[PDB]
Symmetry: C5
Subunit: 273 residues, 5 copies
């Protein structure tokens, strides 16, 4: 945590305010609580509204990765109920849906997806995915091909295809939502204005409190600084949700759960009497 260094600096800023208190009126400088109370309340309001915006983006990030689990379950679930005999079709579609989860993971984590794609799909398909400028959207097209080919075979009617097509439409809203959160953040000015005001408020606070507290200055100033800094750092963990930090989503575990889910519903060996 980088918060603890700021707390140690707040103690140092408090002690230098205590010893230099003699040279205050000799220069003619005064700092009271009431002007800093107005500034602090203003900052406490603005931080609250920013953290609300940061939480709302984190909820949206959590919701979209929840939908990957829902849409892929229901698509395999529909496949098992409508076409219970097409087991060769199942394992092809399943492998694409697992691959979609892993490729979406690596797209948000800015990492190479080649290892996971080769683990799940044949080399003719991995080359096709990597050729595309948008690799994860290619997978949905290739998964869409498999549902389309079953409709082309006559195994799926236009109604049963339409029921399965809507699940792929849900999956497209996941990818488009995840890309939108990754590319467009909370406008940088939000974090730039507040982080500047908080740090400058926390350092100038013991100088404003030294006249009222005298010797209790380091104990109180830290306790006020801690409240304003913890709330500021809370938003700095929620805004970026697709990284590898403490509050950031465990996407490795989530993709493992999806892989476990889709190989739980399938994998049941057909025709053992």
């Amino acid at each position: 945590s980088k918060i603890i260094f700021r707390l140690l600096l707040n103690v140092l800023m408090s002690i230098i305010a205590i010893i230099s208190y003699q040279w205050y009126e000799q220069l003619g400088i005064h700092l009271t609580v009431a002007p800093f109370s107005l500034l602090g309340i203003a900052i406490a309001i603005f931080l609250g509204f920013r953290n609300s915006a940061s939480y709302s983006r984190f909820v949206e990030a959590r919701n979209l990765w929840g939908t990957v689990l829902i849409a892929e379950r229901t698509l395999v679930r529909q496949l098992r109920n409508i076409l219970p005999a097409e087991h060769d079709a199942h394992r092809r579609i399943v492998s694409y849906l697992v691959a979609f989860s892993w490729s979406l993971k690596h797209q948000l984590r800015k990492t190479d997806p080649t290892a996971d794609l080769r683990r799940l799909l044949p080399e003719e398909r991995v080359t096709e995915i990597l050729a595309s400028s948008m690799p994860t959207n290619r997978i949905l097209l290739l998964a869409g091909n498999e549902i389309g080919q079953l409709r082309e075979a006559g195994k799926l009617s236009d109604i049963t295809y339409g029921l399965m097509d809507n699940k792929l439409d849900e999956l497209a809203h996941v990818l488009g939502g995840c890309e939108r959160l990754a590319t467009t953040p909370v406008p940088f000015a939000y974090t730039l204005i507040l982080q500047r005001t908080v740090y400058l408020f926390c350092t100038l606070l013991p100088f404003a409190l030294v006249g009222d507290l005298h010797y209790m200055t380091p104990f109180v100033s830290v306790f006020i600084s801690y409240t304003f800094l913890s709330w500021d750092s809370l938003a700095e963990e929620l805004e970026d949700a697709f990284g590898t930090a403490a509050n950031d989503l465990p996407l490795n575990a989530m993709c493992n759960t999806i892989e476990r889910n889709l190989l739980d519903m399938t994998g049941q060996h057909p025709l053992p009497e």
Copy 2:
């Protein structure tokens, strides 16, 4: 009250603040209202936003369990309307749908679902559901198999199947919603950090209010503490509705309400 231990501790610290006030001039330590007022208003704003997020989680929690009630009612309604003669199918689907509700209750609470599943389903399926790592999802698959088998027999058309399949999707959106809302740790320790900030503000407050109130310190300081601690403990309850430390009554009720409703529709009681 649960927090009444900390309320009497606040009065205990107030009496300490009165007697030790004589020693304050020996080190040159002073505590005015204005520094603790700025901190107090700041905490009050931060508790307001946190409680709003806690309420937001609670409303969505009840909405999902409302959809369990809605989707299962409308699935049984569609079965009676489209296929009025197929009572053998009715009994099986209702058995699975109620088994979905109870298994979801035991999944959110992390409790054993074996006793409830054995009551509603035969042992061939109970072992199959318990073998799966996702038991509630397995029930939806088996419920989907019942709708799917009526389609393959020729009794359900592709459109009438589609109407019933959408109701199974609603329950699957709930399961995925409930799984997400229970297994998310939205803070690292900030649910405890903000709780600790309230605690230490409450205990240091009588030392700050002793100069302005003297003997009225235990009266006013406990009344400020009460308003802050009650609002903090309220957000603690609303954040985890599907908790082991949370009330079991609203979750056990809606599982019985759905069982009572589905048995009434088919005409069994």
Copy 3:
């Protein structure tokens, strides 16, 4: 209703005026600054409470709005697809009107027998009252009317599906309305704030008397009026469907629904 405490607030202020000459005699200090910090905190918590209460009232009004929308569109679809089947029209409308009235009685926790016998044959009223939830039975009986027209050959599976969607939407309303009635916003919400504001407003003139002297009862009743009126509005918005001053006129709403559905069929009330 709030005037009973507004007169009590002036009476408590009179006590604060006469006892001010005994303040330093008893040895008590009460400054404005600690009560300012507490009062701002309460104002924040009431601000979030009233906002949460407003969202309940909006959702409750929206659900009853959807009854009027869904039933209009169901009759509209019946007239466009099957213009000849007026025997179907009159039966379904009488069910949809009965659903609205039984929804009113369910939320109010009252007997619906007086309104059900007015609209429906006696055998159906006995069947409706037999069920655990009367409204869910009506939607099932209205669904059977659409279902029997599908079995006759007059409605295809597609045209059944369009009419079925509105019956699904009405069941989402029923599940929504039941949720807002059966699950109130947790116990503590009113237990904290209502009693906190009462104890704040009565103990405030004791703190105000040091700075205001004889203007104490005039300014204390000002702050009390603003705090209590915001408190009372939030309780009127939370609850709900009943017979309070600021609540939904459900008797007038059900009459508007009945008049709309009779007007579309070519009938006069």
Copy 4:
């Protein structure tokens, strides 16, 4: 602009507080800023939440009238794409949909739609619509008749009818939405509490401020009054959210845009 008359009243109430300040010690009355700070902050919190609720109902009114534009554009678009030859059908439905837009406007504004209805529709239909107690709903039923009769002619299938029916369902949600906003206003308590409080706070404010500010009282008190009254008046206009005021929705401009769009798509 009710504010400018009230701002001059506040300066006039401030000068009373200055001249009667010599009488304060005689009556035994002392007024500090600190209790009025507590009250004013509370008012500012409650005004902030009310204005938030008022803006939310304005956005909802904007979104519903946005849906009028979208659902009617798409229904005409669906008609041209499925049935490119049936122009006799187009002329009636477009005129019905435009009549829906104007009838919804006149129902919300509480004005007579007779002049607009006879401008678009034949006398056999206008007299039938005006006969109905819900004239905007009557248009949706007659618009549904045109889609329904195209289905019964064998020109529209059950599938293509269902795609068009969803748009009529979407416009019916708007009608029920707009009626909900009109018949049920923002609880009159919100206006009864705050407006009484804001006016009484601003009037009583210089009497507490005169003890600390003296001759700067009419400058400071009028600037606090301006902030509190401007925010209250803004929330008042957003609460409606319709009507004839300048701050409200330009519904005449919107209905003409809908009328122009549907006549553009048909080539008229």
Copy 5:
């Protein structure tokens, strides 16, 4: 940023406050921190609510532009799945959809769209687009005609047409949503009330702050003037997300992303 000018002018106003403080009791002028504190907190609350509503407009504008990508991705995807042989049909529809994004961008910015329309579509169609009052809605009708004529031949059934029809309905919701934000912004009172109040508070702030701070008056007044004006400017920027400012949407880059998505490898699959 125009704040840097108003920040430097705020320091100059603070120098006037320092030199004139001696003459305060001579001129008969008293200015304390407490009334300006009450005013400043009130402004900070109203700025907090405005900035939140401003951000909500920015989010909804981004969400609609996100939908442009998603709805067009799937519309081409469905064409690449249902009709994989119709390659000449693909390139015609794709070109309309790329033209839809660019024509939307130029409509919201109020600039000439002819330069980008010629780049993507034939001259017989570009003139038909420019002839219409709403050029972006005309493109949806022209792209819809391509889907409609494939149904006319019998290549698409009524069901598979409906799947593609829903996607063009989704794009029309973006068109109406983006117009709603652009044609009418926030009420003009919102901007004119706050921008008058914020700076007139900031200029009159050092005159009230001089009594407590003396020589530190320009340091603290520029701090508060920074925090209040930076929040007002951010709110003013985000309200018009379709403008050409720093915190606004990069709509030029977004349309290039849509173009590269729909033309994945010159329209191949």
